[PDB]
Amino acid sequence: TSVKPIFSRDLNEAKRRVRELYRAWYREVPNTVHLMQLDITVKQGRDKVREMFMKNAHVTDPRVVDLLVIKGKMELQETIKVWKQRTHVMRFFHETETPRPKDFLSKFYMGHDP
Amino acid sequence: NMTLNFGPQVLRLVLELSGEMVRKCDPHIGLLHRGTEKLIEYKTYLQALPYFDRLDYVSMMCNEQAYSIAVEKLLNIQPPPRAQWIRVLFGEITRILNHIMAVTTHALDIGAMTPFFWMFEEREKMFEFYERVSGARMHAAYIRPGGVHQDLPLGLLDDIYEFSKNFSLRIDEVEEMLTNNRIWRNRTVDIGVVTAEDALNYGFSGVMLRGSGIQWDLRKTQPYDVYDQVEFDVPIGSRGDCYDRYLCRVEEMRQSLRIIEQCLNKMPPGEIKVDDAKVSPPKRAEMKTSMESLIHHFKLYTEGYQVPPGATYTAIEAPKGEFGVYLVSDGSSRPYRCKIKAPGFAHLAGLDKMSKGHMLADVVAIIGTQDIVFGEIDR
Amino acid sequence: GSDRSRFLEGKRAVEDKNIGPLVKTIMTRCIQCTRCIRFASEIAGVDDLGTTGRGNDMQVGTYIEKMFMSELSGNVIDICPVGALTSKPYAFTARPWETRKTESIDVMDAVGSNIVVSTRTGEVMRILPRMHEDINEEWISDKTR
Amino acid sequence: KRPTVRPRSDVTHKQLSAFGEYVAEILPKYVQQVQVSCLDELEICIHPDGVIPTLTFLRDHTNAQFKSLADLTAVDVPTRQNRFEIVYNLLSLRFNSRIRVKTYADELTPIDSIVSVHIAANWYEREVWDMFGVFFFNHPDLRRILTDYGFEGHPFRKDFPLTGYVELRYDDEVKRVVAEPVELAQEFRKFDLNSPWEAFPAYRQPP
Amino acid sequence: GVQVSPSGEKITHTGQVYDEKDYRRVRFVDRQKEVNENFAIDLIAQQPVNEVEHRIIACDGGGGALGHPKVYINLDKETKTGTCGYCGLQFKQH
Amino acid sequence: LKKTTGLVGLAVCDTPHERLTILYTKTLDILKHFPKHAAYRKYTEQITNEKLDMVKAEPDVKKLEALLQGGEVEEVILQAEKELSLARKMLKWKPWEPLVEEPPANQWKWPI
Amino acid sequence: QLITVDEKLDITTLTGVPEEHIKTRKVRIFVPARNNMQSGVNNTKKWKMEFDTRERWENPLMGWASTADPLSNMVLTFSAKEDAIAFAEKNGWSYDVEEKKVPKPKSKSYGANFSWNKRTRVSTK
């Protein structure tokens, strides 16, 4: 309830910053897959971007939103001022991982997870 | 602006250049982080020392000593005189080792590679001593809380004397090559020039201070050991350049022998580990005959010796500076946090200011002065 | 206690007894606390254990090679603070600190004896009672343990 | 006197207590829980809304001259709302002394920085933000320094385990150096060591 | 001394054997299985049974130091011997 | 007389005691702005009064320094300027006021 | 300045753990009962958070015990059930409690052992 804010006061200002950040990533990705000689498509990159955004959509707190924004901005700095490399950036796609079977029977036949 | 990377030839730098001179130097630390302060909390107070040897790997014993002193300030005890003296002795030997490595790696990264090969023989001699005493070359577990592990074999003191009889001539024979060579004078002079207020602020320590006129030595002040007994004159410089720093290191190399002479000629007889068998393990003969000593052996070596809830911040004059330890403890053998403080950290924080306006091949000399070691830094 | 012994003299020892295929008896360790004696003479109504002698020569254990087997024989282990009355199966297999003591119950009977199950590198090594002041009250059965 | 015990003097436990009363009556605000340890050290707990005032005071006021920030540190205790404990270990030369400042903080409760005063913190704060999760305002450059440039989490906390979540390896199938989930070979043995029998009857806590 | 199993594998001193159906015995192919030939059990059985008069006797393990801590044994049980846990030796009463 | 100090970033100040009177008078003239029930005033007032008495009682720096027992004259001047700025800042802050907001209970409780 | 938000806190995002290791992990908040072997009571003072266990198999090479989960050996301390619950529901896990099993008080009228009419009369000494 009665608490202290961070960088903002409401979901709406949080979201305006979030939209600025989306613009940044969208306008950036090409430079990445053109500098670091990647393989994936710009469209696939933008899909990953919007997915990493949508997967935090159960949020309410402006403080949480703002911390996530800060971390995203740090990562964007890291990327555009090229420090992350092919590996650092493709570490997202789980490209060497069998999609965790959500089929209850799959889990049954394979392991012990409930 | 030709911004580029720079590595070996660990030291990952990103230079923001302008033509041939520099505009900024951003280091990229973290290439040697492991999890020291995330492991210790899952361990006792007697299988942690190795971490403090591996930290600032050159000396290792002016670090084991810091850990021991912190644990002792917590446990409200003291070690015995023979232990304190031995510990001063090896502290000075490590001052020598670290000064040697800094000097010679400086001169090597520059290109002069003969003194390196020369002094490494004497370094091998010091390692022979570490072997005769501890058992292994470098990463000895010798110095421990509650005192020390084993006494000194009956063939060491003579060797130490015979080595000190000649280290001075070797130092002079290297000075003949360097401390007057116009080439070195021009590689170092007016480089890394620093002012006292900014040094203090940035948090510099030890040599990076007393090469700028300041008078700060945590052995004259905040005396943690018998260092109040023996004489040792502190050197300082007035200009604040890599040359003055080099000369400080050499003069400390010499005053360290001025210390060792007295350590030898006054080392008393006695014990090594304080006879409080709840803290330091006992001798094996008693461990085998008596019983209570065996119980304490068992406990010490399964559950480290309990420690009361406290907190401290110690400090040492390691070759570089304020090697500090913030050791928090609950009423348990497994501690709660062991924050190291290694000067390389602030030295890097001040690199971006000592390298504003100087050329590309002076960053190396700056780093040589700073005696950058990365084990202590990454943590 | 203290940090050393002022005993430059000789010690004593005592014969060991066979008491059952469960309770390994060493008896040069009994400090003579009498926990076993009282526990037996009160809980298990056995009335076979007792002390035989006076002075250091004292011992604790039946005067003959009788067997102290009972549905509750198997708690003198947890009660004897020392390793005189050890458990033969568990013995020589492991030590406590290595273990990851999980917590569970018994099924051998319909009582509900709270239990501590000790693990080791992914395997069971021993079972212990767990204090529930109502159901099992720090005592459990030979069978379940 | 006894050989195996340091001397518990009076000079320090008195001087530093006087200085504690001094700072307390000067800053009845931005202060709480001053204390002196049984081993000649001073700790000063303060609200995070007074950090820079306290530090400026201790750096400038002649009688303190606490110039050199010998260390900045964090600690994590999860049994409270404000779980992080930020620590500054400071040193003064003229008066040849040290001091310890503490201030509580919490994830989702950032802190005011001191870079304007002690430039050493410019990097300790980066460390803190990387490892624990505590944030600092008015800081020019704040980025992962120690860990990887893609690492995610906050390890030096007490929940992020020792081994970590991911391992690395090369997989010729793609020629890169990929990160997969942790499937160790040996398990991290955790030895139960805490012995019951109470040794310190002075630091006890009744029900 | 060592014995052998159907499949030729040198039984260890503690009954470890890889049965015919186990795939973990490829590492041996083109290689060997390290084992010690001197079995402690036989090497202690061979040893003579010590004899004494003082019913109680103190054992250390050889050297004054360098052996197992001083353990004191009783020997009044004339039915059989008295062993020492650490060293395995066994005494008898006269 | 002299040629330098012994540090780096300093100067051979040839006008001592005057900058000192200036700075101390200015400190006190700012303190005038402080409520008398502020300990900062109540203390630094007398501190600077005694420093002024000392500079007026010792005209030669080579003794004024060892008498003040602080650093060297230039360090003293620097520290006085710093105290001046500290005052100008504590004037905008209201520290002498009472406490801001007490903490929870189980915060400074170590052990835990 | 301040805010009026009566929402329950959750920082599962900043934490940095995946869905699997956050959801399927049942947390247990208990007090470690005494090791009956001992008689010590400086363990039954805290409130400990542990996780459910998981696969713990044997390596084929030598025989060690491995694990797929890192958290198995993550034991956390607390001084109060309310604070432990706050931390648990904050990190988002699914907590289950084991309430306090406390001993009873008793009247040890020693002299009763040497009684006349009662049955407590022991036959030993």
Added chain:
Amino acid sequence: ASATRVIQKLRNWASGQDLQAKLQLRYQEIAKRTQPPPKLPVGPSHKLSNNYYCTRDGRREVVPPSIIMSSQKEKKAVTPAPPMKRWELSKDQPYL
């Protein structure tokens, strides 16, 4: 040392110093190995009386801190401790 007089003279003229007196190598200027079995001392704590631990507990003389200005529980200008006594030069080689 096995080397020649003329070469000694030459290397010495080159360096400037003497070397046969402060060689680095080791020609029997050490302590023989195979040293004799030694016997060791003990501390002042291996007595038989007046050694009660309660006297020298060590890690129980500790006592928790002494709080001041908690939240619930004229004068002079003071400092945290006296100032630093200024240092002096040395009697041996203060300059360089």
Added chain:
Amino acid sequence: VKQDMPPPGGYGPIDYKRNLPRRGLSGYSMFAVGIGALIFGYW
């Protein structure tokens, strides 16, 4: 009986010192020598 590796009543004195020697000759000497050789060459 007790033997724990102490030293005798005293060891010798060590050189914690700089023996960096003063070697060479005078500038007038060196220069005039070089120039005399130069002149012989020219003649």
Added chain:
Amino acid sequence: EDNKQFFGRHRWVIYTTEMNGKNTFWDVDGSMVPPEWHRWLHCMTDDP
């Protein structure tokens, strides 16, 4: 042995041509030193 040289070089060893069914005229390790001599060779003692 030659006790007129400096340290580490005052002892030395000439290996064996063939050692346990093998041709070690060129091939030469440092593990072919049996222990009861190894100890002295490494300067641990002074009596063979």
Added chain:
Amino acid sequence: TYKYVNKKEQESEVDMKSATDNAARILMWTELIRGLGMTLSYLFREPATINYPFEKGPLSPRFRGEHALRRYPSGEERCIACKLCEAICPAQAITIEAEPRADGSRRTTRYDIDMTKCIYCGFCQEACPVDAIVEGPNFEFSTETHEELLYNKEKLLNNGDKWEAEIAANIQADYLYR
């Protein structure tokens, strides 16, 4: 007792003689020639080098290298599964699994080490109350694979039955000090 480096006792002079020496040292390179002379000196000296396989460096009985379990003179082992080595090994390297022995005695069935983790410290031979395990002198056991270094009970027993002709003397010399 502080000092002063890189500073003249007072202001210098402008003597033509001093300027002459300065000019000479700036032209003809006296100091550089002195450095060359020093290098010549060390050239004409004896080198500290040694032939490794035929000459091996010095040491002391307290070395710490390859490991070795041990035995009594009566053939019997010394380990009894007291597990101190496991509970003190800073690296958690060791792995033990004990059992009874058909003859009734107490002994092991698994005493495995990972010499990739063993930092070669000494704590195990400090704790072992029976001197069973003794980190030994052998430092030549480099290999070509990462499975010749996960030693086990039998490899340790072989190393003991091999090197016991040296560890006996080493310890017989070293034990008194400890």
